Symmetry: C3
Subunit: 158 residues, 3 copies
């Protein structure tokens, strides 16, 4: 196994009982890249809830947290605002590659995603947009990068 992962669904409707159509796809793509999926957390578009969810993964030593949702242009979308202050160092390369690949694939919500990416504690944290198309394209870009970052951290033999 490459490492442990957690998925955070950032969606007001999912947090009140609607069918989450994105999370299972993220889970299966993580598993197919070789990650153990420790769990899925659903939160509202709420800064402190999102922070609590990520910080909980960070304190439990999770290797990869993928948040899904809350990267659009409306004031309610606060995943990036919630994430950025938790980052000890940003990895613009991840966020830029996700936007760039989504734009080339014609997935607008991915090209325009305000998502950030970085290391918090021992955890790689990456925001992706909420749609199935964004999760598909974002995950294809992200997972080899995440494998390399995580493999590099454990080859430090720290």
């Amino acid at each position: 196994p490459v490492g442990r992962s957690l998925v955070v669904i950032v969606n007001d409707r999912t947090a009140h009982g609607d069918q989450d159509t994105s999370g299972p796809l993220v889970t299966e793509l993580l598993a197919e890249a070789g990650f153990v999926v420790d769990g899925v957390v659903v939160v509202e578009n709420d800064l402190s809830e999102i922070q609590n969810a990520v910080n909980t993964a960070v304190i439990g030593g999770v290797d990869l947290v993928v948040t899904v949702g809350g990267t659009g242009v409306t004031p309610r979308d606060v995943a990036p605002e919630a994430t950025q202050p938790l980052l000890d160092r940003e990895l613009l390369g991840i966020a830029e590659a996700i936007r760039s690949s989504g734009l080339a694939a014609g997935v607008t919500e991915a090209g325009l995603s305000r998502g950030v990416a970085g290391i918090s504690g021992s955890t790689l944290v990456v925001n992706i947009a909420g749609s199935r198309a964004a999760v598909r394209d974002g995950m294809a870009t992200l997972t080899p990068m995440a494998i390399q970052i995580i493999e590099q951290l454990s080859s430090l033999e720290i």
Copy 2:
């Protein structure tokens, strides 16, 4: 019509009577994408003038403001410095896509543009470099993105 737009020409020479060769091209490309062009404002490379021009569009409820000029490497180029503090949220995807497309087209002043992009109030604000080549390539990248952001805002039915 997709929405209302304003063009802000940021150019010391144009502000003192020289022929503006970029503004008419921006106007015609906006019109061809379906925007009403409310007007054109000419300002110097001057932070408070640029801010006044943009804030005036913001308070009038304009949907898209394209600023043209003042994104180069010299100290006089202050469009990005003027713009960034007005943004309630940045849209790095727009600025990155404009740079990336300009670089692939060999338009140096576009690849290297310090331009930013984001939402201020109800207005999408985007900096592009001053040349005809930069306006051509920047507008081709920008206008479908702007249509999608604006169509999304009005489909909120707010």
Copy 3:
């Protein structure tokens, strides 16, 4: 000659006597693009040493400083943290183009580089990752951009 350049090797091992395998390649690529190479400085992954090295080039009026190393994900990698506060204006276009080209070439440490770029005083400063592959790909992207920025500054006839 296009201008004067300095190379700063940011590497703990090189700073204690190991063979620097990257610096000669950077020197030869600079020379081949037409820069005079004023010198090479070796420093540790140490914020104040890196700053001293860059600020020394800035005060001596150097046109281009390329730093090599210290852009990875581990806490010891501090080239970007050292560089960013010295920049009077950032040139995201350079850093983004370096990441983007490295990603397309399959050079992971380049796609993921946290390197920044910008103008400090009269000096263009650009961080690249430490490997030979990163220096090869980064330099191919950087040197035409650097020539254009420097040629533009001296054509100001300031």
